[PDB]
Amino acid sequence: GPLAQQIKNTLTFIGQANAAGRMDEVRTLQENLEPLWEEYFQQTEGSGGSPLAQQIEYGEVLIEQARAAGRMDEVRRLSENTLQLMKEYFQQ
């Protein structure tokens, strides 16, 4: 419950930062969202998790691999897609 609420709040803050033209904050919010989702995924979904949860989880892995390679344009594209899936998962 509390962890889901923190993820939902983070999605709201990303929306607000985006609407304010504050993409420097969207970068930070996306980075802090990843470990919250990771914890949520490993505790409530995991290997037996729903296909949507697995798609979001692997999407975050692809984002992190793109970030490690410096492909921040790919981070942004993948982040936009994975955020839409998270909004479906959390009904946000």
Numbering used by the authors: 2 to 93
The study reports:
Notably, the tag removal improved the K D value for MID1sc9_4xE by 3-fold (K D = 32 nM). Notably, the obtained K D = 4.66 mM for Ca2+ binding of MID1sc9_4xE reflects a 105-fold selectivity for Ln3+ ions over Ca2+. However, thermal denaturation experiments showed a drastic drop in melting temperature for the metal-free proteins, from 66.3 °C for the MID1sc9 parent scaffold to 37.5 and 32.9 °C for MID1sc9_4xE and MID1sc9_EDED, respectively. Lanthanide binding restabilized both proteins to melting temperatures of 43.9 and 45.3 °C, respectively, in the presence of Tb3+. The asymmetric unit contains a scaffold dimer with polar interactions in the crystallographic dimer interface. However, the dimeric state was not present in solution, as determined by analytical size-exclusion chromatography with static light scattering detection (SEC-SLS) in the presence and absence of TbCl3. Notably, the parent MID1sc9 sequence contributes two more glutamates (E32 and E58) in close proximity to the putative lanthanide binding site, generating a long negatively charged cleft with overall six potentially coordinating carboxylates. Even though the protein was cocrystallized with TbCl3, we could not unambiguously assign electron density for a clearly positioned lanthanide ion. The absence of Tb3+ in the protein structure may also be a consequence of the crystallization conditions, which contained both malonate and citrate. A Tb3+-bound structure predicted by AlphaFold3 also positioned the Tb3+ ion in between the residues E39, E58 and E65, further suggesting that these residues mediate lanthanide binding.
The MID1 scaffold, a small helical de novo protein, was previously engineered for zinc-dependent esterase and Diels–Alderase activity, where it exhibited a pronounced structural plasticity over the course its laboratory evolution. For scaffold library generation, we chose a semirational approach, targeting the original zinc-coordinating residues H35, H39, H61 and H65 for replacements by Asp/Glu. Three out of four hits originated from the MID1sc9 template (termed MID1sc9_4xE, MID1sc9_EEED, and MID1sc9_EDED), while one hybrid variant hit (termed MID1sc9_H1_EEED) showed shuffling with the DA0 sequence in 4 positions, namely T11I, T13S, N19K, and E32L. All variants showed a similar trend, preferring the medium-sized Ln3+ ions, mainly Eu3+ and Sm3+, over the larger and smaller ones of the series.
